[PDB]
Amino acid sequence: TSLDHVFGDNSNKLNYNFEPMGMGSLFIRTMVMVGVFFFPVFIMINDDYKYTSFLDKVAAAKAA
């Protein structure tokens, strides 16, 4: 306590309850994080879908 009159004392305490985040906030932020940090997975899934729909068009208009 020899420096409390120079740099401040220990009377003011931290205002935080150390509690977990709310469930909806955690879910929404995790879904945004999955979308941002795993964007090659969505890009490649979209590539597979766009490729298979073209083969569907070919197989549809070919056998007619």
Ligand X SMILES: CCCCCCCCCCCCCCCCCC(=O)OC[C@H](COP(=O)(O)O)OC(=O)CCCCCCCCCCCCCCCCC
Chain CA centroid to CA 52, Å: 29
C-alpha 18/C-alpha 35 separation (Å) is 28
33 binds, among ligand X, other proteins, none (CB under 5 to 8 A by kind): other proteins
Q: Under the criterion CB under 6 A, does residue 41 sit at the interface with ligand X? A: yes
Least distance between other proteins and beta carbon 17 (Å): 8
Residue 38 interacts with other proteins (CB under 8 A): yes or no: yes
Q: Does 38 bind ligand X (CB under 6 A)?
A: yes
Binding site for ligand X (CB under 6 A): 34, 38, 41, 45
